[PDB]
């Protein structure tokens, strides 16, 4: 059968301001089948309190999920989203770019 690799966007709910509380989002979409593994990373380490949306899909049947956690961005700290899927040989890591 056919398989589709996930698209990945990492971003904040509100425009980032250092020292101000926010929400870090990882939006995964366009993938098939539905089994997927997603972690939010802080300086390479796994964040524990991460929640996610109920599984749903687009008109082309591809699935999407929002993963998110509360965070306070700083100048030094680096955040990332790490995704694994059957279409991926190794976990893909996308770093949070505050201007994207």
């Amino acid at each position: 059968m056919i398989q589709r690799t996930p698209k990945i966007q990492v971003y904040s709910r509100h425009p980032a301001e250092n020292g101000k509380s926010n929400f870090l989002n990882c939006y995964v979409s366009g993938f098939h089948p539905s089994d997927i593994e997603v972690d939010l990373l802080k300086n390479g380490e796994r964040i524990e309190k991460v929640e996610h949306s109920d599984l749903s899909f687009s008109k082309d049947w591809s699935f999407y999920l929002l993963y998110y956690t509360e965070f306070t961005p700083t100048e030094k700290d680096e955040y990332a989203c790490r995704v694994n899927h059957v279409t991926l040989s190794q976990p893909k890591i996308v770093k949070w770019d505050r201007d994207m």
Partner: protein, 276 residues
């Protein structure tokens, strides 16, 4: 304006790991309001929006009974599909369904929907007439013959024209403060030099609802469709959505570019530019 209600079912087999998982979610426009997960500690139709919470125990018990029966039906359909496609019991497969109604300002049915997929490919679909079917392959034609014999299309039509419309209108009234409220995008243009000879202009739209939006770049009044990078519209997490569009421009020609924004919450389409 116009509104929609939509239900999405996902049924996923997993040999060696118990019975197929069944997940159902319900939406009004771009607002999720219910969910069901057969893998939950205690599976029930559960509220995901505040305005549905006022429905009583008869509603929730009724919807829960239905979802449990539905899960059983689609577990059976997964077994049937194996026979239709000459597949073994060892593999994992997925059935998806998506159905619902659209109503116009006057609350009348604009059109109904009921479409199914197998392993991410079109399987069978109720036509816009709500009386006939489109089958995607010879397996779905078997299902079509069964559903024609049992006059299934008539049952769907009765639901799409009746209950679906009536309950959508009910939800629209109970959640009118949010469901019938459009939030316009907050927009601005950012500028990032790539080199001495090029710069990126990025047109941002933030905090809008519903998700439907159009962002286009024009150069000298001409659409730059094939040269624009457009990210997928994404949820912010607070019900609203985000999107941006970017174009790479020659340094010194920034002012020849204009961003055009169309959204239901705006009285007129917006035109903006980079303001240094």
């Amino acid at each position: 304006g116009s509104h929609s209600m939509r239900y999405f079912y996902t049924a996923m087999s997993r040999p060696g790991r118990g019975e197929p998982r069944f997940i159902a979610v319900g939406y009004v426009d771009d607002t999720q309001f219910v969910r069901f997960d057969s893998d939950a500690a205690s599976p029930r139709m559960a509220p995901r929006a505040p305005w549905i919470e006022q429905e009583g125990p008869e509603y929730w018990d009724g919807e829960t009974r239905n979802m449990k029966a539905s899960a059983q039906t689609y577990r059976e359909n997964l077994r049937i599909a194996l026979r239709y496609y000459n597949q073994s019991e060892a593999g994992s497969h997925i059935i998806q369904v998506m159905y619902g109604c659209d109503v116009g300002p006057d609350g009348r049915l604009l059109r109904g929907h009921d479409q199914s997929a197998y392993d991410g490919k079109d399987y069978i679909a109720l036509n816009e007439d709500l009386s006939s079917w489109t089958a995607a392959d010879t397996a779905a034609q078997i299902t079509q013959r069964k559903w024609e014999a049992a006059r299934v299309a008539e049952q769907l039509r009765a639901y799409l024209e009746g209950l679906c419309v009536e309950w959508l209108r009910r939800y629209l009234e109970n959640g009118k403060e949010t469901l019938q409220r459009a939030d316009p995008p907050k927009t601005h243009v950012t500028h990032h030099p790539i080199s001495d000879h090029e710069a990126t202009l990025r047109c941002w739209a933030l905090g809008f609802y519903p998700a439907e939006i159009t962002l286009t770049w024009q150069r000298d009044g001409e659409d730059q469709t094939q040269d624009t990078e457009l990210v997928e519209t994404r949820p912010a997490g607070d019900r609203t959505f985000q999107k941006w569009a970017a174009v790479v421009v020659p340094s010194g020609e920034e002012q020849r570019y204009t961003c055009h924004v169309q959204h239901e919450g705006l009285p007129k389409p917006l035109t903006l530019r980079w303001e240094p």
